[PDB]
Design an enzyme around this catalytic site. Structure first.
Site, PDB file in Angstrom:
ATOM      1  N   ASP A 139      -3.805  13.122  13.336  1.00  0.00           N
ATOM      2  CA  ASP A 139      -5.021  13.783  12.851  1.00  0.00           C
ATOM      3  C   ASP A 139      -6.144  12.785  12.553  1.00  0.00           C
ATOM      4  O   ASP A 139      -6.995  13.038  11.654  1.00  0.00           O
ATOM      5  CB  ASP A 139      -4.694  14.599  11.576  1.00  0.00           C
ATOM      6  CG  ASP A 139      -5.771  15.578  11.203  1.00  0.00           C
ATOM      7  OD1 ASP A 139      -6.483  16.046  12.097  1.00  0.00           O
ATOM      8  OD2 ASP A 139      -5.863  15.960  10.009  1.00  0.00           O
ATOM      9  N   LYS A 142      -9.767  10.997  17.520  1.00  0.00           N
ATOM     10  CA  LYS A 142      -9.132  11.724  18.630  1.00  0.00           C
ATOM     11  C   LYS A 142      -8.864  10.829  19.835  1.00  0.00           C
ATOM     12  O   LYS A 142      -7.903  11.065  20.583  1.00  0.00           O
ATOM     13  CB  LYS A 142      -9.950  12.980  18.987  1.00  0.00           C
ATOM     14  CG  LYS A 142     -10.271  13.893  17.772  1.00  0.00           C
ATOM     15  CD  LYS A 142      -9.054  14.126  16.847  1.00  0.00           C
ATOM     16  CE  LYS A 142      -9.467  14.729  15.556  1.00  0.00           C
ATOM     17  NZ  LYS A 142      -8.359  14.565  14.494  1.00  0.00           N
ATOM     18  N   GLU A 197     -10.141  24.864  11.346  1.00  0.00           N
ATOM     19  CA  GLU A 197     -10.140  25.103   9.942  1.00  0.00           C
ATOM     20  C   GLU A 197     -11.422  25.766   9.462  1.00  0.00           C
ATOM     21  O   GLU A 197     -12.545  25.299   9.748  1.00  0.00           O
ATOM     22  CB  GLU A 197      -9.906  23.811   9.167  1.00  0.00           C
ATOM     23  CG  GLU A 197     -10.884  22.617   9.545  1.00  0.00           C
ATOM     24  CD  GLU A 197     -10.249  21.627  10.511  1.00  0.00           C
ATOM     25  OE1 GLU A 197      -9.465  22.089  11.427  1.00  0.00           O
ATOM     26  OE2 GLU A 197     -10.523  20.421  10.416  1.00  0.00           O
TER      27      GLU A 197
HETATM   28  C1  LIG Z   1      -7.356   4.526  14.543  1.00  0.00           C
HETATM   29  N1  LIG Z   1      -6.479   4.390  13.366  1.00  0.00           N
HETATM   30  C2  LIG Z   1      -6.736   4.960  12.189  1.00  0.00           C
HETATM   31  N2  LIG Z   1      -5.904   4.627  11.185  1.00  0.00           N
HETATM   32  C3  LIG Z   1      -6.095   5.133   9.952  1.00  0.00           C
HETATM   33  N3  LIG Z   1      -7.086   5.969   9.659  1.00  0.00           N
HETATM   34  C4  LIG Z   1      -7.893   6.334  10.670  1.00  0.00           C
HETATM   35  C5  LIG Z   1      -7.721   5.870  11.942  1.00  0.00           C
HETATM   36  N4  LIG Z   1      -8.689   6.447  12.700  1.00  0.00           N
HETATM   37  C6  LIG Z   1      -9.395   7.204  11.891  1.00  0.00           C
HETATM   38  N5  LIG Z   1      -8.917   7.188  10.670  1.00  0.00           N
HETATM   39  C7  LIG Z   1      -9.477   7.891   9.507  1.00  0.00           C
HETATM   40  O1  LIG Z   1      -9.788   9.212   9.882  1.00  0.00           O
HETATM   41  C8  LIG Z   1     -11.208   9.429   9.986  1.00  0.00           C
HETATM   42  C9  LIG Z   1     -11.513  10.226  11.228  1.00  0.00           C
HETATM   43  C10 LIG Z   1     -12.618  11.279  11.187  1.00  0.00           C
HETATM   44  C11 LIG Z   1     -11.152  11.708  11.089  1.00  0.00           C
HETATM   45  C12 LIG Z   1     -10.480  12.334  12.302  1.00  0.00           C
HETATM   46  N6  LIG Z   1     -10.627  13.773  12.341  1.00  0.00           N
HETATM   47  C13 LIG Z   1     -11.708  14.395  12.860  1.00  0.00           C
HETATM   48  O2  LIG Z   1     -12.660  13.745  13.312  1.00  0.00           O
HETATM   49  C14 LIG Z   1     -11.718  15.891  12.803  1.00  0.00           C
HETATM   50  C15 LIG Z   1     -12.902  16.565  13.158  1.00  0.00           C
HETATM   51  C16 LIG Z   1     -12.965  17.941  13.182  1.00  0.00           C
HETATM   52  C17 LIG Z   1     -14.298  18.588  13.549  1.00  0.00           C
HETATM   53  C18 LIG Z   1     -15.513  18.012  13.195  1.00  0.00           C
HETATM   54  C19 LIG Z   1     -16.684  18.660  13.524  1.00  0.00           C
HETATM   55  C20 LIG Z   1     -16.633  19.816  14.248  1.00  0.00           C
HETATM   56  F1  LIG Z   1     -17.806  20.424  14.541  1.00  0.00           F
HETATM   57  C21 LIG Z   1     -15.454  20.422  14.590  1.00  0.00           C
HETATM   58  C22 LIG Z   1     -14.259  19.777  14.261  1.00  0.00           C
HETATM   59  C23 LIG Z   1     -11.843  18.680  12.765  1.00  0.00           C
HETATM   60  C24 LIG Z   1     -10.672  18.037  12.405  1.00  0.00           C
HETATM   61  O3  LIG Z   1      -9.576  18.812  12.053  1.00  0.00           O
HETATM   62  C25 LIG Z   1     -10.614  16.643  12.467  1.00  0.00           C
HETATM   63  O4  LIG Z   1      -9.390  16.148  12.118  1.00  0.00           O
HETATM   64  C26 LIG Z   1     -11.840   8.063   9.940  1.00  0.00           C
HETATM   65  C27 LIG Z   1     -10.824   7.279   9.121  1.00  0.00           C
HETATM   66  O5  LIG Z   1     -11.047   7.641   7.754  1.00  0.00           O
HETATM   67 CL   LIG Z   2      -8.268  28.129   8.062  1.00  0.00          CL
HETATM   68 CL   LIG Z   3      -5.775  17.441   6.370  1.00  0.00          CL
HETATM   69 MG   LIG Z   4      -7.852  17.624  12.139  1.00  0.00          MG
END
Ligand SMILES: CNc1ncnc2c1ncn2[C@@H]1O[C@H]([C@@H]2C[C@H]2CNC(=O)c2cc(-c3ccc(F)cc3)cc(O)c2O)C[C@H]1O
Ligand SMILES: [Cl-]
Ligand SMILES: [Cl-]
Ligand SMILES: [Mg+2]
Length: 213
Positions: A139, A142, A197
């Site tokens: 999660d 991506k 979500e």
């Molecule tokens: C690469 N290795 C990594 N290791 C540890 N932590 C990491 C790491 N890569 C990163 N991390 C952490 O995770 C942080 C990234 C942003 C999250 C990753 N999830 C998402 O982007 C996400 C986005 C949507 C979404 C957003 C906008 C929309 F219009 C529609 C959907 C929905 C979700 O369910 C999501 O999970 C950054 C950092 O805090």
């Molecule tokens: Cl939901």
């Molecule tokens: Cl979560």
């Molecule tokens: Mg997610």
């Protein structure tokens, strides 16, 4: 304050300490009524619950914690003695996650590691005494689902039957990961169509079970 601080405060003031289900409900109410946030949410959460119950994993790895919603969701269903490790590179998110788990009373089941998966995954065996993983929840960014899957295999952390469960395979999407696992004889894949979500937007989870080399 930040959105994540507001979510934690809301839980502290609207859920019951030591009751994980109340914590999930508080988070879902907040994010439905007040401010959207990227928690896996209740629609996909119900599918995660069904997966966890089917496999009863003893050791789960989560990539990307955020506020701890998914960590609470999984940890509350783990058997006594089973454990979750969750990796989160953002120190402010890692702090929120720890406090969320503390409030839920799940601190003894979960270890929140503050760092990047690509740095921490290679340390799992020697530093954290891991043999192989039973389940992995992806999660995080991506475009890192595929590289980290390949790195888990390189490191010898996957066994026959290890369950990968990937959020957001539709939105934002993880097209290289999906193409790869669905095309690989080393994975048995299942798609669980659902919703983003807190939104009326189609999303899905992918389950990819490692079959060995
Ligand atoms: C690469 N290795 C990594 N290791 C540890 N932590 C990491 C790491 N890569 C990163 N991390 C952490 O995770 C942080 C990234 C942003 C999250 C990753 N999830 C998402 O982007 C996400 C986005 C949507 C979404 C957003 C906008 C929309 F219009 C529609 C959907 C929905 C979700 O369910 C999501 O999970 C950054 C950092 O805090
Ligand atoms: Cl939901
Ligand atoms: Cl979560
Ligand atoms: Mg997610």
């Amino acid at each position: 304050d930040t959105k994540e601080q507001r979510i934690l405060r809301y839980v502290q003031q609207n859920a019951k300490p030591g009751d994980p289900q109340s914590v999930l409900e508080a988070i879902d109410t907040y994010c439905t009524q007040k401010e959207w946030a990227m928690n896996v949410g209740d629609a996909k959460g119900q599918i995660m619950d069904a997966v966890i119950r089917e496999y009863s994993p003893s050791l789960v790895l989560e990539l990307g914690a955020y506020c701890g919603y998914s960590a609470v969701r999984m940890a509350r269903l783990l058997q006594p003695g089973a454990r979750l490790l969750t990796m989160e590179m953002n120190p402010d998110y890692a702090a929120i996650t720890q406090q969320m788990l503390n409030f839920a009373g799940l601190q003894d089941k979960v270890t929140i590691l503050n760092g990047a998966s690509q740095d921490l995954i290679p340390q799992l065996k020697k530093k954290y005494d891991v043999d192989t993983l039973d389940m992995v929840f992806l999660d995080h960014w991506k475009d890192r689902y595929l590289p980290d899957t390949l790195l888990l295999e390189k490191c010898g952390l996957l066994r026959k039957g290890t369950v990968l469960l990937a959020d957001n395979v539709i939105v934002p999407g993880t097209p290289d990961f999906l193409a790869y696992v669905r095309g690989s004889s080393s994975f048995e894949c299942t798609h669980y169509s659902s919703y983003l979500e807190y939104m009326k937007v189609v999303d899905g989870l992918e389950k990819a079970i490692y079959q060995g080399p």
